[PDB]
From TrEMBL:
InterPro entries: CRISPR-assoc_prot_Csy4, CRISPR-Cas6/Csy4_sf. GO terms for biological process: maintenance of CRISPR repeat elements. This is Csy4. GO terms for molecular function: endonuclease activity. It comes from the Viruses.
Length: 167
RNA sequence: GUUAGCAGCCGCAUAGGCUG
Protein backbone atom coordinates (compact mmCIF):
# COMPACT_ATOMS: atom_id res chain seq x y z
CA UNK A 1 0.00 0.00 0.00
CA UNK A 2 1.26 3.41 -1.11
CA UNK A 3 -0.28 6.78 -0.37
CA UNK A 4 -0.92 8.46 -3.73
CA UNK A 5 -1.95 11.95 -4.84
CA UNK A 6 -2.76 12.91 -8.43
CA UNK A 7 -1.93 16.00 -10.50
CA UNK A 8 -4.09 16.34 -13.62
CA UNK A 9 -3.17 18.80 -16.38
CA UNK A 10 -6.14 21.08 -17.06
CA UNK A 11 -6.92 24.05 -19.35
CA UNK A 12 -3.56 23.77 -21.11
CA UNK A 13 -4.49 24.39 -24.76
CA UNK A 14 -2.26 27.47 -24.93
CA UNK A 15 0.94 25.61 -24.00
CA UNK A 16 0.24 21.89 -24.39
CA UNK A 17 -0.06 19.05 -21.91
CA UNK A 18 3.55 17.90 -22.26
CA UNK A 19 4.78 21.40 -21.39
CA UNK A 20 2.79 21.48 -18.14
CA UNK A 21 3.99 17.97 -17.25
CA UNK A 22 7.56 19.11 -17.86
CA UNK A 23 7.18 22.17 -15.64
CA UNK A 24 5.39 20.22 -12.89
CA UNK A 25 8.10 17.54 -12.78
CA UNK A 26 10.91 20.11 -12.83
CA UNK A 27 9.32 22.26 -10.12
CA UNK A 28 8.85 19.24 -7.84
CA UNK A 29 12.48 18.31 -8.51
CA UNK A 30 13.82 21.82 -7.88
CA UNK A 31 11.82 22.22 -4.64
CA UNK A 32 13.03 18.95 -3.12
CA UNK A 33 9.79 16.96 -3.24
CA UNK A 34 11.66 13.93 -4.64
CA UNK A 35 13.76 13.35 -1.52
CA UNK A 36 14.16 9.61 -2.17
CA UNK A 37 10.89 8.68 -0.45
CA UNK A 38 8.51 9.92 -3.19
CA UNK A 39 7.99 8.18 -6.52
CA UNK A 40 6.17 9.30 -9.65
CA UNK A 41 3.86 7.32 -11.93
CA UNK A 42 1.71 8.13 -14.95
CA UNK A 43 -1.69 6.39 -14.99
CA UNK A 44 -2.60 7.44 -18.55
CA UNK A 45 0.75 6.74 -20.22
CA UNK A 46 0.28 5.24 -23.69
CA UNK A 47 2.89 6.73 -26.05
CA UNK A 48 3.52 9.96 -24.21
CA UNK A 49 3.14 10.09 -20.43
CA UNK A 50 -0.46 11.29 -20.46
CA UNK A 51 -2.05 14.18 -18.61
CA UNK A 52 -1.90 12.83 -15.02
CA UNK A 53 1.16 12.90 -12.75
CA UNK A 54 0.75 10.75 -9.62
CA UNK A 55 3.07 10.99 -6.63
CA UNK A 56 3.22 8.00 -4.31
CA UNK A 57 4.93 7.45 -0.97
CA UNK A 58 4.86 5.39 2.20
CA UNK A 59 4.76 8.50 4.37
CA UNK A 60 2.00 11.07 4.05
CA UNK A 61 1.33 13.01 0.86
CA UNK A 62 0.24 16.53 1.79
CA UNK A 63 -2.13 18.37 -0.56
CA UNK A 64 -1.31 21.73 1.04
CA UNK A 65 2.46 21.37 0.60
CA UNK A 66 2.01 20.08 -2.96
CA UNK A 67 -0.21 23.02 -3.92
CA UNK A 68 2.18 25.60 -2.46
CA UNK A 69 5.10 23.92 -4.24
CA UNK A 70 3.28 24.32 -7.58
CA UNK A 71 1.80 27.74 -6.78
CA UNK A 72 3.01 29.21 -10.11
CA UNK A 73 1.17 26.49 -12.08
CA UNK A 74 -2.19 26.17 -10.29
CA UNK A 75 -4.06 27.61 -13.29
CA UNK A 76 -2.97 24.59 -15.37
CA UNK A 77 -3.43 21.71 -12.90
CA UNK A 78 -6.00 20.07 -10.66
CA UNK A 79 -4.57 18.46 -7.51
CA UNK A 80 -6.73 15.54 -6.41
CA UNK A 81 -7.49 14.07 -3.02
CA UNK A 82 -5.16 11.65 -1.20
CA UNK A 83 -5.77 7.99 -2.02
CA UNK A 84 -3.93 4.69 -1.64
CA UNK A 85 -3.03 2.00 -4.17
CA UNK A 86 -1.79 -1.57 -3.89
CA UNK A 87 0.44 -2.02 -6.97
CA UNK A 88 1.90 1.09 -8.63
CA UNK A 89 3.66 0.99 -11.99
CA UNK A 90 7.21 2.30 -11.50
CA UNK A 91 9.56 3.90 -14.01
CA UNK A 92 13.26 4.63 -14.51
CA UNK A 93 14.91 7.11 -16.87
CA UNK A 94 16.81 5.72 -19.87
CA UNK A 95 19.61 7.93 -21.18
CA UNK A 96 20.88 8.15 -24.76
CA UNK A 97 24.63 8.47 -25.41
CA UNK A 98 25.61 10.26 -28.61
CA UNK A 99 28.64 9.24 -30.64
CA UNK A 100 30.36 12.50 -29.73
CA UNK A 101 29.76 11.94 -26.02
CA UNK A 102 31.30 8.46 -26.22
CA UNK A 103 34.27 9.62 -28.31
CA UNK A 104 35.10 12.47 -25.92
CA UNK A 105 35.06 10.16 -22.90
CA UNK A 106 37.16 7.59 -24.79
CA UNK A 107 39.80 10.26 -25.47
CA UNK A 108 39.92 11.15 -21.77
CA UNK A 109 40.05 7.59 -20.45
CA UNK A 110 42.09 5.81 -23.15
CA UNK A 111 44.36 8.77 -23.96
CA UNK A 112 43.92 8.23 -27.69
CA UNK A 113 43.78 10.79 -30.49
CA UNK A 114 40.54 12.05 -32.01
CA UNK A 115 40.95 10.05 -35.21
CA UNK A 116 41.83 6.91 -33.24
CA UNK A 117 38.61 7.34 -31.25
CA UNK A 118 36.64 8.02 -34.43
CA UNK A 119 37.93 4.74 -35.86
CA UNK A 120 37.25 2.77 -32.66
CA UNK A 121 33.66 4.07 -32.74
CA UNK A 122 33.37 4.10 -36.53
CA UNK A 123 30.37 1.76 -36.57
CA UNK A 124 28.56 3.29 -33.57
CA UNK A 125 25.33 5.06 -34.52
CA UNK A 126 23.72 6.21 -31.26
CA UNK A 127 20.75 5.39 -29.07
CA UNK A 128 17.43 6.34 -30.70
CA UNK A 129 14.74 5.92 -28.05
CA UNK A 130 11.01 5.97 -28.78
CA UNK A 131 9.76 5.54 -25.19
CA UNK A 132 7.53 8.21 -23.61
CA UNK A 133 9.62 11.16 -22.48
CA UNK A 134 9.45 14.42 -20.55
CA UNK A 135 11.55 17.38 -21.67
CA UNK A 136 13.84 18.58 -18.87
CA UNK A 137 16.05 21.67 -18.57
CA UNK A 138 18.90 20.94 -16.17
CA UNK A 139 20.35 24.09 -14.61
CA UNK A 140 23.57 22.67 -13.16
CA UNK A 141 24.49 20.89 -16.40
CA UNK A 142 23.03 23.58 -18.67
CA UNK A 143 21.36 21.06 -20.98
CA UNK A 144 17.90 20.38 -22.34
CA UNK A 145 17.20 16.69 -22.88
CA UNK A 146 14.38 14.19 -23.35
CA UNK A 147 14.00 12.10 -20.20
CA UNK A 148 12.81 8.77 -21.60
CA UNK A 149 10.72 6.74 -19.16
CA UNK A 150 10.90 2.94 -19.06
CA UNK A 151 8.70 0.74 -16.90
CA UNK A 152 10.82 -1.04 -14.32
CA UNK A 153 10.62 -3.28 -11.29
CA UNK A 154 9.81 -1.27 -8.17
CA UNK A 155 13.20 -0.99 -6.48
CA UNK A 156 11.63 1.04 -3.63
CA UNK A 157 14.52 3.50 -3.97
CA UNK A 158 13.94 6.71 -5.93
CA UNK A 159 16.04 9.55 -7.33
CA UNK A 160 15.48 13.32 -7.53
CA UNK A 161 12.84 12.81 -10.25
CA UNK A 162 10.77 10.15 -8.48
CA UNK A 163 12.17 7.36 -10.66
CA UNK A 164 13.49 4.01 -9.48
CA UNK A 165 17.23 3.53 -9.01
CA UNK A 166 19.15 0.37 -8.16
CA UNK A 167 19.66 -0.43 -4.48
C1' G B 1 3.00 11.14 -29.47
C1' U B 2 6.34 16.63 -26.76
C1' U B 3 10.88 20.26 -32.17
C1' A B 4 13.39 17.02 -27.88
C1' G B 5 16.50 12.91 -28.03
C1' C B 6 21.72 16.50 -24.40
C1' A B 7 26.14 17.20 -21.02
C1' G B 8 28.72 14.33 -17.71
C1' C B 9 30.44 10.70 -13.94
C1' C B 10 31.43 5.06 -12.67
C1' G B 11 33.12 1.04 -15.70
C1' C B 12 37.90 -2.86 -19.85
C1' A B 13 33.42 -1.54 -22.47
C1' U B 14 30.43 1.37 -28.65
C1' A B 15 27.47 -4.14 -21.35
C1' G B 16 25.11 -2.03 -17.47
C1' G B 17 24.51 1.85 -13.97
C1' C B 18 24.19 6.74 -11.83
C1' U B 19 24.14 12.46 -11.74
C1' G B 20 20.90 16.62 -13.82
Amino acid sequence: MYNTISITVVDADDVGVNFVVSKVLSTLHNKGIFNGEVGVTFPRMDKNVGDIITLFSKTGVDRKVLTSTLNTLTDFIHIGKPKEADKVKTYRKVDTKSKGKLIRRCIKRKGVSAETAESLYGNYKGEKCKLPYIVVNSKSTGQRFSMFLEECENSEKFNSYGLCIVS
